């Protein structure tokens, strides 16, 4: 509930590491925007949402729970941000546009979450 098993700091500590990561993705705006905001299945027009990903998630909820402090363990934010590029991954059938957008997000992030997952977990 509170402290998983590893270190687990203040939701702000994490953010210190986490957010910067998200922020690298935030630079990848054309790749992050599709998530910086909720993955509107209406704006998208994909009723198949929640019927594939099961865990929608989006840099909106992400950059939020992070910022707001709805965390305690960094791997949680990771499992979410990754769960995000994931929706773009197993949802867009891979051969799509987000495919490129999520690819990077997970890339930079996997490159951002290193200084994080290391100083966070």
């Amino acid at each position: 509930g509170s402290h998983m098993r590893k270190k687990i700091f203040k939701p702000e500590e994490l953010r210190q590491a986490l957010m910067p990561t998200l922020e690298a993705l935030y630079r990848q705006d054309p790749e992050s925007l599709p998530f910086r905001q909720p993955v509107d299945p209406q704006l998208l027009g994909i009723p198949d949402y929640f019927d594939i990903v099961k865990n929608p998630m989006d840099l909106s909820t992400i950059k939020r729970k992070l910022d707001t402090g709805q965390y305690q363990e960094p791997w949680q934010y990771v499992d979410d941000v990754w769960l995000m590029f994931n929706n773009a991954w197993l949802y867009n059938r891979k051969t799509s546009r987000v495919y490129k957008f999520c690819s990077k997000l997970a890339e930079v992030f996997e490159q951002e979450i290193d200084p994080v997952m290391q100083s966070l977990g």
Binding site: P30, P34, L44, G45, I46, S96, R97, V98, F101
Partner: peptide, 15 residues
């Protein structure tokens, strides 16, 4: 092509 429409940034459009 592409543009912002329909799905995410999808919007194939061919016909």
């Amino acid at each position: 092509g592409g543009a912002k429409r329909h799905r995410k940034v999808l919007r194939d459009n061919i016909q």
